[PDB]
Structure 1
């Protein structure tokens, strides 16, 4: 596909925000949720799942660009 056009700016902003401030806020939210739910039931596996989700987010733009040319 083409990254330009009438919606090029919106797509660019979303792609940079995926690894930018909103993405970091969401990742910090996952970290806070993992810490909070670990008070009663300590489970560090959810931390690993959160790290994997962060890795997926870091590669989200590449995946989208590969699937949608």
Structure 2
């Protein structure tokens, strides 16, 4: 596909925000949820799953660009 056009700026902002401030805010919310739900039932596997989801988010732009040429 083409990264430019009328919607090039919107796509660019979304791609940078995936690993930018909004993505970091979502990751921090994930860490907060993992810590909070571990008060009654301590489960560190959710931390591993959250780290995997951050890894997926960091590669979201590459995945989208590879699927949508």
1:25 to partner: Cα distance: 0.1
Q: How far did 1:65 drift? A: 0.0
TM superposition shift of 1:61:
0.2
The Cα of 1:45 is off from its aligned counterpart by: 0.1
CA displacement at 1:30 relative to structure 2 = 0.2
In structure 1, stretches of 5+ residues that fail to align are none
* Equivalent position of 1:5 in the other structure: 5
Q: Using the alignment, how far apart are the partners of 1:31 and 1:37 within structure 2?
A: 10
With normalisation by structure 1, the TM-score equals 1.00
Task: Provide the TM-score with structure 2 as the length reference.
Answer: 1.00
Task: Note the alpha carbon deviations across 1:29-55, whole angstroms, 9 max, x for none.
Answer: 000000000000000000000000000
Deviation (angstroms), 1:20: 0.0
Deviations 1:4-32 (A, max 9, x none): 00000000000000000000000000000
Distance 1:17 1:61 in 2: 10
Displaced runs of 4 or more, over 4 A: none
Q: Aligned Cα RMSD in Å?
A: 0.1
Question: What is the CA distance between 1:58 and its match in structure 2?
Answer: 0.1
* Match of residue 20 from structure 1: 20
